[PDB]
Structure 1
């Protein structure tokens, strides 16, 4: 016979404290972009991106990430 007894006790306090978050600045792609193309012979799929893209400013006042997994496999 199999007897399995499980007690994960977790009182964990993933805590943060800031008095003043601020005065944050993010200036991507300030300058000039210039592209000039002539006499191109493509013979397969193409992608192109030009400019400012995908520019993130994540400012999480908390930003307390917590991750938890319980796998319990039985054969």
Structure 2
């Protein structure tokens, strides 16, 4: 009687996520012109004038690997 138990694992488990490997080449500009006599912002206002913005959230992207190996004679 003999038992040979040799599972081989060469796997990869991966998460590539968010903003990866992108090229942003000479973005933006021209002219942006806001003109008034009053600007009035007064509850939960968000304003973007001529800005460039890059924003990334990754709440996810997590990995799990679980293995249970058992040998009972």
Q: TM-score range by the shorter chain?
A: 0.3 to 0.5
* Residues 3/16 of structure 1: CA separation in 2 closer, same or farther (3 Å cut): same
Q: In the alignment, is the contact (CA less than 8 A) between 1:28 and 1:55 conserved in 2?
A: no
Q: Sort the Cα spacing of 1:5 and 1:64 in 2 relative to 1 into closer, same or farther, 3 A.
A: same
- Structure-2 residue corresponding to 1:12: 11
Say which structure is richer in strand. 2
| Rg comparison, structure with higher value | 2
TM-score normalised by the chain length of structure 2: 0.40
Quote the Cα distance in structure 2 between the aligned partners of 1:71 and 1:39. Answer: 75
Gaps of 5+ in 1: none
Q: Deviations over 1:6-39 (max 9, x none)?
A: 2211011001101339999999999999999999
Where do 5+ consecutive residues of structure 2 fail to align?
A: none
CA offsets per residue over residues 20-74 of structure 1, 9 Å max, x none? 3999999999999999999999999999999999999996554110110011111
